[PDB]
Assembly symmetry: D2
Homo-oligomer: 150 residues x 4
Amino acid sequence: MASQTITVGPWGGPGGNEWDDGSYTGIRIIELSYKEAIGSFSVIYDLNGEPFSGSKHTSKLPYTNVKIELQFPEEFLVSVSGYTAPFSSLATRTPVVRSLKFKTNKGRTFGPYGEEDGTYFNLPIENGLVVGFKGRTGDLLDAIGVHMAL
Amino acid sequence: MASQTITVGPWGGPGGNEWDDGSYTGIRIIELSYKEAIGSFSVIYDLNGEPFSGSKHTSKLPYTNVKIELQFPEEFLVSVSGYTAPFSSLATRTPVVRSLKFKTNKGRTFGPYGEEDGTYFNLPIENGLVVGFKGRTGDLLDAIGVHMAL
Amino acid sequence: MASQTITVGPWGGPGGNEWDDGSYTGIRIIELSYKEAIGSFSVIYDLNGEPFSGSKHTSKLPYTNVKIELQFPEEFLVSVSGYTAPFSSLATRTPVVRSLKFKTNKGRTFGPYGEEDGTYFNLPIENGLVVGFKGRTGDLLDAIGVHMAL
Amino acid sequence: MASQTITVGPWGGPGGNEWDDGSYTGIRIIELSYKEAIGSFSVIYDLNGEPFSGSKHTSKLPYTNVKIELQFPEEFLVSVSGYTAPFSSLATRTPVVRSLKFKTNKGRTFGPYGEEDGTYFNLPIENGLVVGFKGRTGDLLDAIGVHMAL
């Protein structure tokens, strides 16, 4: 009944708990953690020209934390890609996000973070903007998906 | 370069301080002041299921204050209408928003607030949602416009 | 259901037969007739860089024909306005579109066509495009509305 | 300057000649040819409730033709997936579309068609509609991408 955006994904598995940051006006900063898989994931959005911090989707695992700072508004994502697969450290074979990689319209590449093991996924954007993330997190990132707008 | 919505209007005159709340996912509360014209105007938006207070656009004039509380998300605006006309007691005789009235999908009418003098305007929304307001305010609400999505 | 657009209006009365051209990529030509009111109203749309003729909504009345050819794609509408009121030679006081006027981003005004009698309506477009018309036609244009997209 | 949709992909290689059907209001029929790779690809779109013929992107190769007829409007795509890879029958190592598969909101799957060799791609759609295709076609289908709307 409230406003909606085109949403694609998720890529990954059905474990963890779903979260959805919803939609905003663009992306300023992406933060994540990684080792053999992706752990934490959080975003600072643009909301009508000011930063807005999304909720944190934190992993307690001892991973490396990274920060991707885009030159907003002139720089934005044109590609989200990665790999999904079971991870043998978990108690089950549920597929999780093993790797993530981002590319921008200014020709910068961020990543790959994690391990490129399993099934590649790739979302090239020819026209339009990522405006929001949604996903699934348990101990780590089980799945990821994107809201898009013009 | 950032995400955009359809913007219609403004209705009213050219004077006053320009403002633009930008766009959100819906409307929870509208607060305005009125007497001979509309004075203050501010909104508590929905942003992805949580309230978000927009900036206040307060008139310094001692007017009657009113709070319009919609049963969000099931109830939302289907019509924005009112009247614009010069406000004779300013030197510039500039047109301002003299009256506003709001109708909802649930058949509730809020208003008219102010005086029904001058040029009537009406935005009947058959499909889509109001997701943001913009305008101009000096001593009074000089003009108001609307962002739409869906 | 199928793809949708923001839809506003209609302005006018509930007489005549309803029609909806649906949505396209833009507006290339507006064809109308007029005298004391608007008679015929039909549109040549853009569809993906080629013209597409909307259904004809023609009046049999011996009115003056107008053909408005926009400089598509660089020139597009920024305002649709007009007047609605009853028309004395009908069996009921049902309101019809007495006048129309169109303005473009290049500064061109087309109109008024018809007679500026009754209640003024005005749709200023600050951001977005008209991508389709809907309306009601009997012997005259009883009502007119618009589909909008970014 | 004209109206626009979110465009994702293409998936495939840089060879062949660029084509773009543009956008419409939904999909009625997809017809393609296949054997070890995808040859022909063309679509009957919905445009405001009536069928619209897309341009044919046909291959001369002796492949099997198949017609995917959806129960439009109640049935629509919720996934487009396939495989892209070099093809040893060609005089270039450029990747091409080796296989395609479609799924609908009514639980039907069409495909896989062609050969599942190389790099999998997958566009799951949680919210929104495919409203158009674009791609590259030489002797066969080098690449495929999609236009989306709400």
